[PDB]
Design a protein around this ligand. Structure first.
Ligand SMILES: Cc1cc2nc3c(=O)[nH]c(=O)nc-3n(C[C@H](O)[C@H](O)[C@H](O)COP(=O)(O)OP(=O)(O)OC[C@H]3O[C@@H](n4cnc5c(N)ncnc54)[C@H](O)[C@@H]3O)c2cc1C
Length: 393
């Protein structure tokens, strides 16, 4: 029997298994999971897992009925493409095709003190146990994850401080103009802008000042880095992530990658995109399955993955929807400026809609997503009215 080996045990790995089976794959499937848990969903870790009574985010995938050999507590540590062999913490195994789906790891600060990052079920459970009335929580970075952790900490009675090097919350992701508009949402947080953090100390954090800010709990949310250090020396093309083409093929034949670990050339956006988004990992698994099962005698084209990216965040009681891929070079146009129903659009030098941000208004996002896909060039009157449809029929 042929053998496809999937390295990693999250959304991309689980969904690739389902897709490979639904689309006719009858060979062997082995999944190498570094974690000692069946794959589970991550968006809930900073949401339900902190706040709700029930929060088991394990996927419904039935690996017994899909004849998937799931190997828990086994991490890949090396790759020998010429031998079609992967090295792991539990020994060697060979493959006929290999899928890299190891996700990304949180960036952390230096220092000796206790420092939480949100990536596993253990992280969320131990962080939840520390979010209690009378606790001082310091969040490093005014990021999506920090905003979500801040929400849960406030609801559980914590004092929250958030230290951001940039000029406004979410400035790294959305820019200073848009981020500045979210300040009222942070009104219950001790938010310190334009402030760098040097390290996590035994008693809290130390600012670039050298000044200290005491804390009972420190949570760092300053981004993630693809988990690719095990690929060192394999000769695979890397660029802060595994480089794949629009068909999720790496630089080496028979080896594929998708999800948070992957950096993908996008014909649409004319650059490499490193978008750690739930929807992008999930959608890529369907494309990847189609690529792997492409009958060689068939003359059909090879499936492509180049969607308009989508991301959401649940914070401060609201729902933020973001679609597209804007550059700092793009022009920001606020929709409904001066009204509570405002949204944000970005257009390029040719007037083409590149991205759109809405709040509690998915109808606006859905229309914007199709407008971006179509390359729509809405006029100023349409952009300034939040309710105006931007997509062609
Ligand atoms: C707290 C949190 C909240 C989020 N909220 C949102 C949200 O609201 N909306 C949104 O769109 N996105 C959200 N995301 C992003 C989204 O969850 C990710 O894009 C998605 O999980 C990526 O799936 P993946 O399978 O590529 O990676 P992961 O889900 O990270 O899976 C990778 C798995 O492989 C394992 N692994 C790592 N190294 C190895 C190795 N060497 N060998 C074997 N296994 C290994 C990891 O332990 C992990 O189990 C959030 C992410 C986090 C962390």
């Amino acid at each position: 029997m042929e053998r496809i080996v999937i390295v990693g045990g999250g959304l991309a790995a689980s969904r690739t298994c389902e897709q490979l089976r639904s689309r006719g794959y009858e060979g062997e499937l082995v999944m190498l999971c570094a974690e000692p848990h069946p794959p589970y969903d991550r968006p809930p870790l900073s949401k339900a897992a902190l706040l709700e009574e029930e929060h088991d985010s394990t996927f419904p995938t039935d690996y017994a009925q899909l004849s998937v050999d799931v190997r828990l507590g086994v991490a890949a540590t090396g790759l020998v493409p010429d031998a079609r062999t992967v090295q792991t913490t539990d020994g060697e195994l060979s493959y006929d095709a290999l899928v890299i789906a190891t996700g990304a790891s949180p960036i952390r600060l230096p220092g000796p003190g206790r420092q939480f990052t949100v990536r596993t079920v253990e992280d969320a459970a131990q962080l939840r146990a520390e979010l209690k009335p009378g606790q001082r929580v310091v969040l490093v970075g005014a990021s999506w994850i920090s905003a979500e952790v801040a929400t849960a900490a406030l609801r559980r009675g914590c004092s929250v401080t958030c230290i951001e090097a940039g000029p406004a919350p979410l400035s790294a992701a959305l820019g200073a103009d848009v981020g500045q508009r979210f300040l009222p949402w942070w009104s219950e947080v001790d938010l310190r802008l334009d402030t760098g953090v040097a390290e996590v100390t035994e008693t809290g954090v130390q600012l670039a000042n050298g000044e200290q800010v005491d804390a009972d709990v420190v949570v760092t949310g300053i981004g993630v880095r693809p988990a690719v250090d095990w690929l060192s020396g394999s000769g695979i093309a890397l660029d802060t992530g595994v480089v794949v083409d629009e068909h999720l093929r790496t630089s080496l034949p028979g080896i594929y990658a998708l999800g948070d670990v992957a950096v993908r050339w996008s014909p649409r956006w004319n650059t490499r995109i490193r978008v750690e988004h739930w929807d992008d990992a999930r959608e890529a698994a369907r494309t990847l399955a189609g690529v792997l099962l492409h009958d060689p005698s068939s003359q059909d084209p090879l499936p492509v993955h180049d969607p308009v990216p989508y991301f959401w965040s649940d914070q401060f009681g609201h729902k933020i929807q973001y679609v597209g891929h804007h550059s700092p070079e793009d022009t920001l146009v606020i929709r409904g400026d001066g009204t509570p129903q405002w949204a944000a659009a970005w257009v390029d030098a040719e007037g083409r809609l590149t991205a759109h941000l809405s709040i509690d208004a998915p109808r606006l996002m859905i229309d914007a997503r199709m407008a971006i896909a179509a390359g729509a060039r809405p006029d100023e009157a349409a952009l300034r009215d939040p309710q105006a449809k931007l997509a062609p029929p």
